[PDB]
Design a protein around this motif. Sequence first.
Motif, PDB file in Angstrom:
ATOM      1  N   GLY A   1      16.431 -14.522 -29.151  1.00 18.10           N
ATOM      2  CA  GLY A   1      16.417 -13.949 -30.475  1.00 18.10           C
ATOM      3  C   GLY A   1      17.339 -14.268 -31.567  1.00 18.10           C
TER       4      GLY A   1
ATOM      5  N   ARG B   1      16.844 -11.227 -33.532  1.00 19.68           N
ATOM      6  CA  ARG B   1      15.627 -11.911 -34.099  1.00 19.68           C
ATOM      7  C   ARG B   1      15.990 -12.299 -35.531  1.00 19.68           C
ATOM      8  NH1 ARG B   1      11.409  -7.331 -32.010  1.00 19.68           N
ATOM      9  NH2 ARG B   1      12.889  -6.274 -33.169  1.00 19.68           N
TER      10      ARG B   1
ATOM     11  N   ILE C   1      12.737  -8.990 -39.779  1.00 22.23           N
ATOM     12  CA  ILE C   1      12.954  -9.547 -38.510  1.00 22.23           C
ATOM     13  C   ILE C   1      12.074 -10.662 -38.237  1.00 22.23           C
ATOM     14  CG2 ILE C   1      14.020  -7.177 -38.397  1.00 22.23           C
ATOM     15  CD1 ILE C   1      11.592  -8.460 -35.869  1.00 22.23           C
ATOM     16  N   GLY C   2      12.441 -11.396 -36.977  1.00 24.85           N
ATOM     17  CA  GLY C   2      11.520 -12.541 -36.840  1.00 24.85           C
ATOM     18  C   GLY C   2      11.407 -13.404 -38.039  1.00 24.85           C
TER      19      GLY C   2
ATOM     20  N   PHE D   1       8.916  -9.436 -39.942  1.00 24.40           N
ATOM     21  CA  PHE D   1       8.396  -7.996 -39.416  1.00 24.40           C
ATOM     22  C   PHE D   1       9.212  -6.972 -40.164  1.00 24.40           C
ATOM     23  CE2 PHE D   1       8.112  -4.192 -36.384  1.00 24.40           C
ATOM     24  CZ  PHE D   1       6.737  -3.868 -36.817  1.00 24.40           C
TER      25      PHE D   1
ATOM     26  N   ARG E   1       4.067  -7.067 -40.142  1.00 20.76           N
ATOM     27  CA  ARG E   1       4.308  -8.443 -40.279  1.00 20.76           C
ATOM     28  C   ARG E   1       3.809  -8.963 -41.552  1.00 20.76           C
ATOM     29  NH1 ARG E   1       3.209  -5.686 -35.328  1.00 20.76           N
ATOM     30  NH2 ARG E   1       4.973  -6.355 -33.985  1.00 20.76           N
TER      31      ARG E   1
ATOM     32  N   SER F   1       5.168 -13.582 -38.390  1.00 18.44           N
ATOM     33  CA  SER F   1       6.498 -13.052 -37.747  1.00 18.44           C
ATOM     34  C   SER F   1       7.023 -14.071 -36.429  1.00 18.44           C
ATOM     35  CB  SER F   1       6.339 -11.779 -37.028  1.00 18.44           C
ATOM     36  OG  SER F   1       7.429 -11.336 -36.703  1.00 18.44           O
ATOM     37  N   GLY F   2       8.170 -14.305 -36.448  1.00 22.99           N
ATOM     38  CA  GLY F   2       8.619 -15.515 -35.405  1.00 22.99           C
ATOM     39  C   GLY F   2       7.847 -16.657 -35.558  1.00 22.99           C
TER      40      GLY F   2
ATOM     41  N   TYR G   1       3.369 -14.926 -35.074  1.00 25.25           N
ATOM     42  CA  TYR G   1       2.661 -13.654 -34.587  1.00 25.25           C
ATOM     43  C   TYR G   1       2.415 -12.815 -36.048  1.00 25.25           C
ATOM     44  CZ  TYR G   1       1.679  -9.271 -31.843  1.00 25.25           C
ATOM     45  OH  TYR G   1       1.379  -8.308 -31.441  1.00 25.25           O
TER      46      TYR G   1
ATOM     47  N   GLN H   1      -0.912 -15.208 -31.426  1.00 30.78           N
ATOM     48  CA  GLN H   1       0.042 -16.304 -31.680  1.00 30.78           C
ATOM     49  C   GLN H   1      -0.693 -17.291 -32.375  1.00 30.78           C
ATOM     50  OE1 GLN H   1      -0.466 -14.897 -28.689  1.00 30.78           O
ATOM     51  NE2 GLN H   1       0.969 -13.387 -28.904  1.00 30.78           N
TER      52      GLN H   1
ATOM     53  N   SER I   1       4.413 -18.171 -30.895  1.00 31.36           N
ATOM     54  CA  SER I   1       5.444 -17.257 -31.495  1.00 31.36           C
ATOM     55  C   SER I   1       6.859 -17.474 -30.441  1.00 31.36           C
ATOM     56  CB  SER I   1       4.955 -16.058 -31.491  1.00 31.36           C
ATOM     57  OG  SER I   1       4.940 -15.388 -30.245  1.00 31.36           O
ATOM     58  N   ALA I   2       7.701 -17.233 -31.352  1.00 32.23           N
ATOM     59  CA  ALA I   2       9.305 -17.132 -31.165  1.00 32.23           C
ATOM     60  C   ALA I   2       9.727 -18.367 -30.762  1.00 32.23           C
ATOM     61  CB  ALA I   2       9.358 -15.971 -30.168  1.00 32.23           C
TER      62      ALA I   2
ATOM     63  N   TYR J   1       5.814 -18.598 -27.104  1.00 33.70           N
ATOM     64  CA  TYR J   1       4.908 -17.656 -26.233  1.00 33.70           C
ATOM     65  C   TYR J   1       3.604 -17.575 -27.121  1.00 33.70           C
ATOM     66  CZ  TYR J   1       2.876 -13.365 -24.369  1.00 33.70           C
ATOM     67  OH  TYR J   1       2.251 -12.449 -23.939  1.00 33.70           O
TER      68      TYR J   1
ATOM     69  N   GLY K   1      12.433 -17.554 -27.947  1.00 31.77           N
ATOM     70  CA  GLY K   1      13.491 -17.004 -28.592  1.00 31.77           C
ATOM     71  C   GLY K   1      14.992 -17.855 -28.410  1.00 31.77           C
TER      72      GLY K   1
HETATM   73  C1  LIG Z   1      11.333 -12.159 -29.560  1.00 31.28           C
HETATM   74  C2  LIG Z   1      10.873 -12.554 -30.992  1.00 31.28           C
HETATM   75  C3  LIG Z   1       9.905 -11.560 -31.359  1.00 31.28           C
HETATM   76  C4  LIG Z   1       9.390 -11.718 -32.664  1.00 31.28           C
HETATM   77  C5  LIG Z   1       8.100 -10.902 -32.983  1.00 31.28           C
HETATM   78  C6  LIG Z   1       8.482  -9.732 -33.836  1.00 31.28           C
HETATM   79  C7  LIG Z   1       7.258  -8.793 -34.201  1.00 31.28           C
HETATM   80  O1  LIG Z   1       6.718  -9.249 -35.125  1.00 31.28           O
HETATM   81  O2  LIG Z   1       7.150  -7.528 -33.857  1.00 31.28           O
HETATM   82  C8  LIG Z   1       6.909 -10.804 -31.952  1.00 31.28           C
HETATM   83  C9  LIG Z   1       6.719  -9.561 -31.298  1.00 31.28           C
HETATM   84  C10 LIG Z   1       5.694  -9.388 -30.385  1.00 31.28           C
HETATM   85  C11 LIG Z   1       5.071 -10.605 -30.223  1.00 31.28           C
HETATM   86  C12 LIG Z   1       5.164 -11.631 -30.656  1.00 31.28           C
HETATM   87  C13 LIG Z   1       6.236 -11.877 -31.716  1.00 31.28           C
HETATM   88  N1  LIG Z   1       4.696 -12.588 -30.214  1.00 31.28           N
HETATM   89  N2  LIG Z   1       3.687 -12.187 -29.317  1.00 31.28           N
HETATM   90  N3  LIG Z   1       3.948 -10.806 -29.272  1.00 31.28           N
HETATM   91  C14 LIG Z   1       3.326  -9.996 -28.290  1.00 31.28           C
HETATM   92  C15 LIG Z   1       9.660 -12.630 -33.551  1.00 31.28           C
HETATM   93  C16 LIG Z   1      10.895 -13.606 -33.071  1.00 31.28           C
HETATM   94  C17 LIG Z   1      11.360 -13.521 -31.972  1.00 31.28           C
HETATM   95 CL1  LIG Z   1      12.464 -14.356 -31.516  1.00 31.28          CL
END
Ligand SMILES: Cc1cc([C@H](CC(=O)O)c2ccc3c(c2)nnn3C)ccc1Cl
Length: 290
Positions: free
Chosen positions: A41, A92, A138-139, A155, A160, A185-186, A202, A207, A232-233, A249, A280
Motif C-alpha cells: 500500500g 494506501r 485512500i487508495g 475510498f 469508493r 479505488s486503488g 475497485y 475489479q 485493483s491495487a 488483484y 500494492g
Molecule cells: C491494498 C489496496 C486496497 C485498495 C482498496 C481499498 C478500498 O477501496 O476499500 C481495495 C479494497 C478491497 C479490494 C480491492 C481494493 N480490490 N479488491 N478488493 C476486495 C486500494 C489500494 C490498495 Cl494498494
Amino acid sequence: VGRLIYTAGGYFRQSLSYLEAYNPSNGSWLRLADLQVPRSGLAGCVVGGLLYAVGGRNNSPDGNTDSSALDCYNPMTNQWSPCASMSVPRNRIGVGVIDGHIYAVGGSHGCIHHSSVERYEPERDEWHLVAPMLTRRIGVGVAVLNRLLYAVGGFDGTNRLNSAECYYPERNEWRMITPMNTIRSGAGVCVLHNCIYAAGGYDGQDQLNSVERYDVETETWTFVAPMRHHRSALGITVHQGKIYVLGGYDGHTFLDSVECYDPDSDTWSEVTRMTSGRSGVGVAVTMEPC
Ligand SMILES: Cc1cc([C@H](CC(=O)O)c2ccc3c(c2)nnn3C)ccc1Cl
C-alpha cells in the motif's frame, strides 16, 4: 545510459520487502537490496536519480503496522537509507513530485481515512503539511501535470469515489475537477502527454479493466482501450512514453502480469511477468544501478 522500472514492496499472503528492476530494453529482472521494513500500500517516486518509498503498511504474522516511513534508494550504492518520517502513517497512499518536492496524499491510519496532504523537501529532509484535500481518499490515484497535483478516486471510509480534485501550489488550495465516468479505488493513475490516466481499480463490487483519461484543456474524461486483465491495487509508471501496469488483484489471483499501453495504436499488450504475483507495490523509473 538506460532506465529501469523499479517495483518495491507489495503483498502476497503478507507484506513484502522485495525491490526488483525491470529493463524494457532487454526483458531482464534484477533483484536488488530489500526494503528495511516490509510494506504494501506504498507509493514509489523518483527525485534527482534517487528512488523513494512512501507510506504503506506492514501486514505480518507479528502484527499490522501502518507506515509513516520515507526511505531512499540510491542505484549507485544499492543501499536503502531512512529519511524523515511523515506527520502520520499513510497506508494506501498516493504520491506526486513537483519541482523536486514529494507530496504525500491521503491514505489510512487504522480506521482514519486522511484528507491531509504533506510535502517533503529533500534538500532539508523535512516534511510540512499543506492544505488538506476536499475529500478523504485512500487508495487514491495521484499525478502531476503542468506542475499541478491531482488526486483521483479512492475510498473515503464509506464510498469508493469517481470524484477527483486538483491542488494549485501557489494558492495552497484544492478545487474539484470533472469526476471520472467510473468509480475507482486503488486504480493506477499517471500522466502521459497532456492527459491524466486512470487504469483499473475497485468499485466495491468488481475489479476493473477499463481505462479513462482526463484532458486538462477540455476538462473531460474519455475511455481508451481496456487492459487485458481486470486489476485493483496495481502499480503504474511511464517509461519512454508508454504506460506500464504491474500486478494487482483481479478477484482471484495476485497478478504477476505486466501490461503496457501504446497511445498511438490504443492497444494493451503483455510485456512480461513479475517474478511473482503481488498487489500494492510502489513503482517508479530511474537509472540502472551500479
Ligand atoms: C491494498 C489496496 C486496497 C485498495 C482498496 C481499498 C478500498 O477501496 O476499500 C481495495 C479494497 C478491497 C479490494 C480491492 C481494493 N480490490 N479488491 N478488493 C476486495 C486500494 C489500494 C490498495 Cl494498494
